[PDB]
Design a protein around this ligand. Structure first.
Ligand SMILES: O=C1CC[C@H](N2C(=O)c3ccccc3C2=O)C(=O)N1
Ligand SMILES: [Zn+2]
Length: 109
C-alpha cells in the first residue's frame, strides 16, 4: 500500500508519471528555474510521463537544460500546463520536466 507512488494532474486526476520514473539531471531530479516572464518553477525531471499533450514544435530558446529543446506539455485531459517535454539532447535524448506543485502524488492504480 505505498501512498507515494504515482503522480496525477492536480486539477483533474489524469495519470501522468511515477516516483520510480524520477530522473536526476545533472545530479538532482529537482531544478529551480525561471522563465522570461519571471515565473519561478520547481521542476521535477522524469524519464517518462503519460497523459499529456505536447503542443507545437520544439524550441531551444531559453532552455533550462543544455542541449535540449522543449515543447509545452499540457494535461491531456484538462489542458492544465504541467511542464515541458525535452528532446534533442544526449544521455538521455529526451525527458519531461514537470512542475511539482501542479501534480498530486498518491497510491498506485
Ligand atoms: O526550458 C525552458 C522551457 C520553456 C520555458 N519558457 C516559458 O515558460 C516561457 C513563457 C513565456 C515565454 C517564453 C517562455 C519559455 O521559454 C523556459 O524559459 N525554459
Ligand atoms: Zn488535468
Amino acid at each position: 500500500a505505498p501512498g507515494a507512488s504515482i503522480f496525477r494532474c492536480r486539477q483533474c486526476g489524469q495519470t501522468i508519471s511515477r516516483r520510480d520514473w524520477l530522473l536526476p539531471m545533472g545530479g538532482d531530479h529537482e531544478h529551480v528555474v525561471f522563465n522570461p516572464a519571471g515565473m519561478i518553477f520547481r521542476v521535477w525531471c522524469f524519464s517518462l510521463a503519460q497523459g499529456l499533450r505536447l503542443i507545437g514544435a520544439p524550441s531551444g530558446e531559453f532552455s533550462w537544460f543544455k542541449g535540449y529543446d522543449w515543447t509545452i506539455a499540457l494535461c491531456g485531459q484538462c489542458g492544465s500546463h504541467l511542464g515541458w517535454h525535452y528532446e534533442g539532447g544526449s544521455q538521455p535524448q529526451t525527458f519531461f520536466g514537470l512542475i511539482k506543485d501542479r501534480l498530486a502524488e498518491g497510491p498506485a492504480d
